Amino acid sequence: PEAFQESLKHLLPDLSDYSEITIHLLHQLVLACGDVSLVNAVRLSQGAIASARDALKAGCPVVTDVPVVAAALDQTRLAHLGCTVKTLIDDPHITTAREAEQAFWHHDHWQQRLQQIPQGSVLAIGYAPSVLLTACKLIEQQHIQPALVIGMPIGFSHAPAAKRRLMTSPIPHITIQGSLGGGLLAAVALNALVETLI
Amino acid sequence: PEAFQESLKHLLPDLSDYSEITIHLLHQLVLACGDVSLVNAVRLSQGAIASARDALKAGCPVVTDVPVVAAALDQTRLAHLGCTVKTLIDDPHITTAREAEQAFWHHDHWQQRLQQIPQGSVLAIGYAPSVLLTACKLIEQQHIQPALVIGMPIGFSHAPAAKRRLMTSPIPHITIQGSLGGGLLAAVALNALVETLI
């Protein structure tokens, strides 16, 4: 789980184009939010790219936390690959970490839907830290086994240590160290991996 | 001129894919020589990629110092663009900085061929520091005006300060700070820019 400069170092003596893909992803994130810091804050695990491509080529399920993340996904490219897209809740108005944490407090069985995610799924969490925390716990206990976790919720003061907990996970992941998150960032990240595949 | 990490910083809030192109070029260099240091040593100037693409799209002439550089160029792609390829000398056996400096000492009129390079041409120097130095001098005096200079000669003890002199040039350029050079590196660099255009 390392930064741009370090990743790039070890990916350049590779036959694959993982270095080009990594910088494409950073570029797309910066074009979404306008913040060059993400070169530092963004963290990919070794084998994140490879696990992503392998899962996408096999037409993996894709699960997002909330609808706005799903709706920003490149839906037609994903359909061509045979990937289906689902959300953990259906609330149409979620724009902040507070609206998200509130909404995941009302629904009584989103944890059920998370627990049922198919092995090999891509899990993209753009809004709610508590959902990312629950995902990390289920992974540790070996109840779920996604191919990839994209964890880019917003970080708030006294948040569930979620992004930091994801960095210790044995599951391939991409995250944003610190309090940056939300917007469409999680969807942009996944889109960058989709568009460099087809 | 500036390194990888710095270039990348200022190229990410750009609409164009110059950040992806830069990392592709680094990647190709590392696949040619196997040396990850070039991330540090390689230096691009601010307008380098853009000037390259503009000149290649216009079917610019390409001039190399020696045949082995020309022969490593992607000849068919360049022909499709309308770019011609020429060399400053025709010696078929040049493998080291010594064989190159020797050969540019015998020929009496390579400086004439250099002085004649058309405005807007791409100049790729892979072997001889003294040729790069002469090129820098002609540029300062405004006798020649290439669109781009790729300067990747070998750096030897008490060499003509050439690579360092190229970094002060007003002409867009790509070079390798320090004593690394030769092989096919100059040709690989140019090829990376050609293949990401067509």
UniProtKB/TrEMBL annotation, chains A, B:
Mention one GO biological process in which this protein takes part, according to its record.
Answer: regulation of DNA-templated transcription
Under Gene Ontology molecular function, one entry of this record is: precorrin-8X methylmutase activity
Q: Which UniProt keywords apply?
A: Cobalamin biosynthesis, Isomerase
Q: In which pathway does it act?
A: Cofactor biosynthesis; adenosylcobalamin biosynthesis
Q: Which domain of life is it from?
A: Bacteria
Similarity annotation = Belongs to the CobH/CbiC family.
Listed name of the protein: Mercuric resistance operon regulatory protein precorrin isomerase
Q: Which species?
A: Synechocystis sp. (strain ATCC 27184 / PCC 6803 / Kazusa)
The gene designation is merR
Q: Which residues of the full protein are shown?
A: 161 to 358 of 370
